[model samples]
Target: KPHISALNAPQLDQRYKNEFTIGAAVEPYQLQNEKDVQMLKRHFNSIVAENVMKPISIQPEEGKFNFEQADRIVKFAKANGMDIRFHTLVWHSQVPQWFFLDKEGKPMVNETDPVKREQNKQLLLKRLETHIKTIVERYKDDIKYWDVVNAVVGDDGKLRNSPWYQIAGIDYIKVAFQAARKYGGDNIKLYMNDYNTEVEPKRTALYNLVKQLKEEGVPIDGIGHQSHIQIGWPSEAEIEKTINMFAALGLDNQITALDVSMYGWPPRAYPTYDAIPKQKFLDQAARYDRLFKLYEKLSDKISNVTFWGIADNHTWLDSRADVYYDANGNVVVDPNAPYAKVEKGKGKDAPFVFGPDYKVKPAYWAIIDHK
Candidate 1:
C-alpha cells in the first residue's frame, strides 16, 4: 500500500516535472480537510477549482462579486508553492440567470424579434466584458492561465447554441479571449476548453474553430481537451490523433479533467463499488498506463494534465452516470437508476489515483512505474 507521503512513493509532480505539471480539480471545502490538503500538496503542482471559480461562484449577481471562497483556494495554492489554473470565465452553464434576462425580466430565448435579438446581443457582450475583465484583473498576479471559454462546441460539430452563442454569436468567444488577453497580462495563456475533443467530427470541428480563431488573430493561446474519458473507448490512436491534429496548428494542448470512468459511454448501470470485480481495476490501471505514457512521449506538445477529481470515493463520476431530463425538462440524476440497469448494481465511476482509503491505487502506480 502506497501512502501519499511515503518516502518511497514517487511524487507525481516531481515525476512529471520534465513533461508537464500534474493537476487536479479541487473544491474549496476539500481544502478544509487536513489530509485532503496534504494529499493535494503532495501530488499536484497545479489546481483548477472544481466550482468556486466559475462565473456563478465568482460573480453570482451581476456586479456583486464574491471572491471570498475562491480567494481562499488561491491563497492555499500560493502558500503551498502551487500554480493556479483559473477555471472558466465564460460558460453556458453555471452562469447566473440575469445575464440572459431582458429589461422586462424575460428570458432572451423568448425574444423572437430581430431588432430585440440584436439589442440582446450587445447587452450580453457588455455583461461578458465586465465579467471577464473584473475576474481576470483581480487574479492577474496570482494566476497564469484561464479556461476563457468552455464546451463551446456541441457534439454535432457545430458551436453549442448556448444562450451566449445565441445572443452574442461567435463573437462572444472572440470578445472573451480579447478581454482575457488584455486584462490577464502578457504572460497569461488563454485556453478554449471543451469535452469530447478527442472524438470527432467534434475533433475536426474544434480544429477548424481554433484554426479560424488563430487566423483571425484572436489572441487565443491553447486548447484544453476535457479528457473525461472512459476505460474502454477512445483508443490510444484517437487521443494521439487529436493531439497531433491540433499540434499542426501550433497550439498547446493540456489534458484537463482527465478521469477514466469505469463505466462505458451511453452510461448504463454497473456493479456498485462493493461488487466490482478486481479485473475492472486492472483494466483501469492499464488505461492510465497507456495515457500517461503517451503524454510523456508528447510532452513537448502538452503543457499540463489535470484530473477531474482527486479520489475515487469522491468524484463527479459517481453521480454523473445516470442523469436525465424529466418531462418538464428539469435535469435529474439517480445513480442507482441509470439509463439502463444490470441487476442489483448502481453505476459507479471509480477512476482516480487514490482509493477511498487514501491509499495510492494501481492506476497511480501505472502512471509512475513507467520505468
Candidate 2:
C-alpha cells in the first residue's frame, strides 16, 4: 500500500501524523496558465516563488517597478490558504544592467579612489533599499519566510566574486539582509542562500560566514542550501554533515532546489553503442533512499525539503544541466535515468511508465515512498 497520498487527497493531512511540512519549488512563468496553477495547488502546503521577486521582473527599468505577476501569485496563495516564501530580495543574477555602470556605460573602477566606489555603491544600495522595502513591506504580513539574500557563495568556499561583491565587496550581502530586516520588520525570517554547500571548502566557508554574521549581530535568521545534487557528486554522508553543521549555527536550514540525477556520460563525451540502455536505476534508487532517510532523521532540524520539479517531465535538469547527444550522433537516453526512465533508441514513451496519464513518473512515487 502507498504510505503517502496526493496533495489533494482527502486523507493526506491525516496520514502524515507528524507536522512535517511538504512543499514544491515553483516558477511564476510555469504557472502562467490556469491549468498549471490548478496543478500547483494540488501538491504544496507552502509556495517558494522563484524569479518573480527578482530585479528583472520587479524592477524592469529605472524608477519603474512592476508587481503584477508576483501579486497574482501572492493572491493565489492567500486564497488557497498556503504559506508563501519570498524567494529573494537580492541576488547577483537577474540584476538590472544599470546597476554597475555610470552614465557613459563604462565599468566604474577606482576602488581606492573612494569617490567612485562610493558613488556606485550609493546608487546600488539605493536600488537595493528601494526594491527590498517595496516588496517586503507590501507582503510583510503575508510572507513569513524571506530568502533575503540568494546565491552569494561560489563553487569555492568564499563569497562569490560576483559583480555585486566585486563592486561593493562582501559588505553588500550584509546590507541586503539589513535592508530586508528594516523593511520587513522583525516578523519575517531572513535567509542567506547558496548551492553546492555540501562539499569541502564551500561548506566550511559558508558555515564560517554564518557564524560571523551571527556574531556581528546581523539580522540573518536562516540558511538555504540549494541542494542541486548531481549523481556521484556530494555523497549522502557529506550532505548530512553539511546540514548538521549549519543546524548547529542555531538557525533554520532548508533543502531547496532538490533534484537528483545520474551521470549518463561525461559532460561533452559522446555515447557509444555500448552506452545504450545503461541500467543505472539501482544506483539512482540507492542514492534517493540514502538521502531521504537522512532527511527523515534530520526532519526535526530542517524547515522544508522542496523538490525542484514535481516530475522529470517537468524538470529543468535536461534543458539546463544534462548532456544530449552521444559521440556517434545517436541520442543518449539512459534507461535508468534518475528522473524519468528513458529508452536509448526509442522515443519519449518507449522506456518507462511515468504515470497512469503519463504525467508523474516513477521518481514521483519514489519521493512519496521516502517521504
Candidate 3:
C-alpha cells in the first residue's frame, strides 16, 4: 500500500479503486499554485468547484452571465482526466441583490398588491429557470454531477430563508431540479446538499425531504451530507446511523465533503477545537481511517468521499478569498491579501492533510492508509 505522503504513494483513486470515488473541492485560485494542482492530480479522481459556480459568482448582474472562471475550472478538470461536479445552483445566501428585484430595480416581495405578488412569483420562478439553465447548459457536456439545491430546510423540518422558499414556495425545489434536468442532460447526477445532517431533527428533516422529493418525481439522484465535522461532534455511531438511513433509501448518498475543525464545543474537558494542539491532526487521521473502514463496510450506499480542501491553507471556515471577482472583470488575486490568519488557530494554515506549505502532514499518509 502507500502513504499519502510518500514520495510516490499510490494515487488516491488507485488506492481505493473498488471502494468509492475520491474527490476534492477545487478552488480556482489553486490553479495558479503548482503544488495544489500537483497534489490534486496525485490524489483525487472526482472534482467539485468549492465556490466558483455558485449564483453570486456566475450571475451577479441581473441579465449578465459570466463563465470565464467557471469554464477555466471545468476545462482544467477535463484536461487532467478528472470527473467534474459543481456546487449549488439555487441558494438564498450569497446571492446577488438583483435576484429579488424587478425591471425598475425594486424588491419583488415589496410589491404586495395581490396582483403584483402573483406576478412576482412567476418572475422569480422564471429567473430561477434562466439562472439554472444558463450554468447547467454551458457545462452540461463536461460536468458529471450537480448540487441542485442547498440548505433550504432548517434542522427542525421546516423550509428555511431562501428567496425560492419565500417567493416561489416549495415548488422552487422542484423547479431547480427540473431546470437542471432540462439542460444538464440525463447523465449528470443531481443532489440536494446540507450541513450537520448526520443526526436527529436535521437527519429526520433531510430524510423526509428526500423521500418526498423522490415520491414527487423531482429527479433527485442523491443526498449530500456536508460531513463538515470536528474530531467527535457527531459520534461515529451517529455517522453510521445516518449513512444507513439514507443509503437504505437508495438515493446514492455521498459524503460529499469531509472536514474537521474545532469550533463545536460543550463539555469543558472536551477542548476548544477551532484549531490547535497539533496532536489533533493525529486525531483527525484516526477519524478519517475509521470513516473509511465504515465506508468500506457500507460502500454499497455511498457513492463518493470528497475532502473540502486539498491543503490546510485552503478552507471555507477561515477562508476570506474574494469570490466576487467575475463582477470586477478580473481573474487574479490581490497580492497583498493575507491568506493565513493566526489569532484563532485558523486562517490560511489550519490542520488539513497538507500543511500551508502544501506538503503532506501525517494526515495525508493516514488518509491514504500510509500510517
Candidate 4:
C-alpha cells in the first residue's frame, strides 16, 4: 500500500541525479546504537567519520596506536555500501601531550631557542610523519578521501596563530601532507578543512593558501568548508562566492559540518525554528532558501554537502551553545549548567532538517527539492 507522510518526507530510497552526494557528519560513538546506523543508511550515500581518525583517538600514546573504535566505523560504512570520508588525520586540538616532546623527555621548542627548540622541532616533525604514515598506510586502500589537515585557517583568512607556527612554522602543514602521500601511495585525496571560509578575509586566505599548496606541488585534493553557519553572520552571497572561488582551484569543495542556530537573538531577527517563533522561522527560511539556491547552482562543481547531525534532538549545537532551563531548577537559564547556553541557540533546534520524530522537516524537503 502507498503511504503518505509529512510535508516533505523523503522516500528512504530516494536518490539524486548528477552524482551530487548528500551525507551526514557523524562521530563513532554515535554509531553504537543500531537505530542511528539505520537512520544514517536510509539517507546518506557517503559517511564522514567524525573523530576516530584524529590524533588523540588514533595515537593516544607515543607508540601505541588504537584503531578499534575507528575500525568499527569503517566496517559499518562498507557494510552499508557507503563511501567513507575520513574526517581528519592532523589537528591542533585533541592532540596528545606526548607528540610535542622528545625522547630525552624534554619539551619541544621553536627554532628561535638555540638547542632545545631545534630538538623539539625535529621531534615534532618525526612524530607527525610517523603518525601520518602509519595511519594513512593502514587505510590507504580502504579510505580514499581524507581531511589531512583541519582548522589550520584563522578568522583573519591566514594560517592560524599557534605553536605549530611559532615552532615548526609553515613547514608543519607541508610535512603532514608529505607523510600522507608517502604512505597513501597512489590513491588518497587529501584535503584541508576549516570553518567560516564562506566569509571575508578567512575565505580569501583559504583561496590563496590552497592555490599556493597546489602550485608548490602539494598533493592536496580538496577543501572542506566547515559550514557552521548562523543566520545573521555570513550572508548568502558570501557563502556562494567562497564556494565558487574555491571550486575554481579545480579541487573538490565540501560543505562539511553544516548547521544553523538561533538562541539569544530575537525571534524577528532569525526565525527558522518553531521553538523560537514563526516570524523568526520565516527569516531563517529565507536564509536557507538563499543558501540552498547557491548550492543548486554550484551542485555541479561541489562534490558533497553534509549535515553535522540528522535530528535536532541529537544536535551538538544544543549542548554546546544554547541556553536551557530545567523546570524543576530554580534558575531561568543557568549559565553554569553543562547543557545550558549553546553559543548559537538556546533551547532551539535551528539547523536540522529532521524533527523530534525523525521525520523530514520543511528544510529537508527544501534541500531535496532544490537538488
Best by lDDT: 1
CA lDDT of 169 in candidate 2? 78
Candidate ordering by lDDT (highest first)? 1, 3, 4, 2
Question: What lDDT does candidate 3 reach at residue 195?
Answer: 85
lDDT of 2 at 99: 69
Model 3: how far residue 305 lies from native, Å: 1.0
**Model 3 stretches astray by more than 4 angstroms:** 1-7, 265-275, 319-351
For candidate 3, what is the TM-score? 0.86
- Candidate 2 has an lDDT of 0.66
Clashing residue pair totals per candidate (backbone < 3 A): 0, 4, 5, 15
Query: What do the candidate models score in CA lDDT, each in turn?
Result: 0.83, 0.66, 0.75, 0.71
Give the runs in model 2 whose Cα sits over 4 Å from its true position: 1-19, 29-35, 103-105, 109-112, 264-282, 321-327, 332-360
lDDT of 1 by residue, 1-371 (tens): 34453323668899999899999898888999777787787888998888989999988897799999999889998998888888889888968989999888889888999999999889989999999999988999999878999999999999999999988789999999999998887899989999989877888888999899999999888899988888877888889999898887888998889899877655543435665667888899889999889999899999999998777767887666543444654433443442332322335667887777667777888888864
Provide TM-scores for the models. 0.91, 0.82, 0.86, 0.85
Query: For model 1, what is the alpha-carbon lDDT of residue 98?
Result: 94
lDDT digits (tens) for residues 220-268 of candidate 2: 8888887877556788788888888888889888776677654433332
Candidate 2 residue pairs that clash: 270-326, 270-327, 271-326, 271-327
Q: Give the alpha carbon lDDT tens digit for every residue of 1-371 in model 3.
A: 22244324557777777888888888788888877778878878888888888899899887788788888888888998888878889877798878788666788766768777788888888998999988887888898888899888786667775666777778889999999998978899999988888867878888998899888888999888888787667888888898888878778878777876533432111112233556766787777677677777888888888888887666775543222122443322233333332223222224366666555666667766733
